[PDB]
Design a protein around this ligand. Structure first.
Ligand SMILES: *Cc1c(COP(=O)(O)O)cnc(C)c1O
Ligand SMILES: *Cc1c(COP(=O)(O)O)cnc(C)c1O
Ligand SMILES: CCc1cc(=O)n2nc(C)c(C#N)c2[nH]1
Ligand SMILES: CCc1cc(=O)n2nc(C)c(C#N)c2[nH]1
Ligand SMILES: [Cl-]
Ligand SMILES: [Cl-]
Ligand SMILES: [Cl-]
Lengths: 357, 360
């Protein structure tokens, strides 16, 4: 139905701007402004940019009772020329609309939201840092807001966006706990959408990981222990495959994998190089062990917006530590992926992937 | 530590809501009472509990309750008998379940008997909102949410516990319901969180419930596994009263193996039937193959869901792919259903004193 329009934006500037930072911790520091859009039985209201402020919700809000909530995560980068650019934001907009439809929340126009986000970033561009490795994290959210305890398609909703200046998350490698007792997502489920409900249950599992000397969780699937995701990151393996061919593999989008923007960007980059096989195929612990013993594994890493390419060096599997020679192999592929992404994101090389603010 | 009911502060309302009219029927979960329970937790532990005028919540925009679904809820009923005495039905079990949910989401622990007392005190304040016409009750909705103003996926250092109340009647206008049973839809899985009453389990079902409507059915029969196990009906547990394949008369409901929410009404129906000792009462997996066969052999007496909002819900039809299966629940009395409803009514409205009722 009829989406809100960036033409109808309403600006309300803060009366007292907040003092910028001077070691930015991920997701804790927020900027002066936010986008807010209300939806109800009269359709979408006018978007507005307003000072960062608390939400007022009815205590029966379906957002809080039945997890009618979804989110996105994407980054804006400030180049030398002081120009700010979003990385592949259309893909985030596409994913967000898919999430919306899955939870029966209102459809909106992807380009209208992008423009409202652009404007919001414009208003707050001084918050976008420019130091090496820094960026602005953009967190759009769409939540149901029905004031009723019936499990139902909501007739009210709020779409809002907040911004965080950020540095890194932690090229330092990580250890993973691989315990098949915990299952992140199931074929036929909603693991392939960026819905809040997929994340809350992982908190206890991440604590078990820390208590057991690991930093992230490696989510395994199926009776053949398929490697699916690392924490909130897609997983990649750079090895020589069972048929003697050097390749980059990541599991295919079969339902239990969130289709990451960085994931897709790395598959694209590597395909464009034309220097080795790039494939989407199931990866099992059985295959990984055999390859590790036969010395065919060069690099293992996770990919995601907050930690774009995360080296892995250890997997704790069936109480037995497995060493991953990632850091011993350069890590060349990882360093090469990081360099090209940096050149693109900071505008050193022009690229259609970037959207200027 | 825990908040204490001894520390309760009361703020009475200065804008009381007009209560539901005479010929104005109660719609489930839409009408709220005048007051609410509110308790905050942070690095200092739990603050003091407050009973306060029903009012909006004020949440930071990065609240982890809204980004990563750090949220759980409960649902239980208070019943007013003819002598105007209000009683809660087996609230201890909801308190137990709420605390398990909390631990699963790394949300803060609390004292079950302190929460129960705060809830009793809350209902006492709004006692006149408890209706007393037949089949009516007061639905009680506790909630516990994470409230970390941080975008990292982590254990919150701040939380919020609150409770709101609604006067209710029946969920639907003992008219049986039809169910959509399609194996494409998966509510929960072994190793997941289907056995906890966490907000994240419900949101994904809204779309599936719309497909049930679109295909002419009223609720979703959630199927699991290669063998199409019957797990749950909508937000209710499922029971089958049949003559099994070994020729024995039994009431069966799926076992608590991870994909089943352990209902209070479920447990109570098992307790009641087990206590009668008139037939076999088991927890065992139930498959579509088994149901299909039992229906063609006329061994099925009654099928029904159980849950707080619709305590004993008869089923008359199941649309399994294209096979429209008639369930003969209503032609069989429904004798067991009526018996369960009659006993529950006697216990709930205080006709017959019982250890299951907690007086307010
Ligand atoms: C967000 C996310 C990813 C990666 O997504 P990006 O779009 O690259 O940031 C991968 N797996 C899970 C489970 C995620 O939530
Ligand atoms: C709440 C619930 C039930 C039944 O719980 P009761 O405690 O009897 O009200 C059954 N199934 C699901 C999925 C539920 O959420
Ligand atoms: C989805 C936002 C987010 C939260 C969070 O705690 N993490 N942790 C990591 C390692 C990432 C990434 N990428 C991430 N991303
Ligand atoms: C959990 C509260 C609740 C919401 C809702 O939409 N429903 N629908 C039904 C049939 C029930 C029950 N029991 C129920 N219970
Ligand atoms: Cl997908
Ligand atoms: Cl009890
Ligand atoms: Cl259980």
């Amino acid at each position: 139905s009829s989406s809100f329009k960036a033409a109808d934006l309403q600006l309300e500037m803060t009366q007292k701007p907040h003092k910028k930072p001077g070691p930015l911790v991920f997701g804790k520091t927020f900027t002066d402004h936010m986008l807010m859009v209300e939806w109800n039985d009269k359709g979408w209201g006018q978007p507005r940019i307003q000072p960062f402020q608390n939400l007022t919700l009815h205590p029966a809000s379906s957002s809080l009772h039945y997890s009618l909530q979804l989110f996105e995560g994407m980054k804006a980068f400030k180049g030398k020329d002081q120009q700010v650019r979003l990385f592949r934001p259309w893909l985030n907009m596409d994913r967000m609309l898919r999430s919306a439809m899955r939870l029966c929340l209102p459809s909106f126009d992807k380009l209208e939201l992008l423009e409202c986000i652009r404007r919001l970033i414009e208003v707050d561009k001084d918050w976008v840092p420019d130091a090496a490795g820094t960026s602005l994290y953009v967190r759009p959210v769409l939540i149901g807001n029905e004031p009723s305890l019936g499990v139902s398609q909501p007739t009210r909703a709020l779409l809002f966006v907040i911004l965080c200046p950020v540095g890194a998350y932690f090229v330092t490698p990580v250890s993973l706990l691989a315990d098949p007792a915990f299952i992140r997502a199931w074929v036929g489920g909603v693991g392939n959408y960026k819905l809040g409900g997929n994340y809350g249950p992982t908190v206890l599992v991440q604590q078990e990981a820390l208590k057991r000397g690991c930093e992230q969780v490696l989510w395994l699937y199926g009776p053949d222990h398929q490697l699916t995701e690392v924490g909130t990151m897609n997983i990649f393996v750079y090895w020589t495959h069972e048929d003697g061919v050097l390749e980059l593999v990541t599991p295919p989008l079969n339902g239990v994998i969130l289709p990451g923007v960085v994931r897709q960007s790395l598959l694209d980059m590597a395909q464009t190089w034309g220097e080795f096989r790039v494939v989407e195929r199931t990866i099992t612990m059985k295959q990984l062990l055999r390859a590790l013993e036969e010395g065919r594994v060069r690099e293992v890493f996770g990919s995601g917006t907050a930690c774009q390419v995360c080296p892995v060096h250890r997997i704790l599997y069936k109480d037995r530590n497995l060493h991953i020679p990632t850091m011993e192999n350069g890590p060349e592929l990882i360093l090469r992926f990081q360099k090209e992404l940096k050149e693109i994101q900071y505008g050193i090389r022009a690229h259609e992937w970037m959207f200027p603010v």
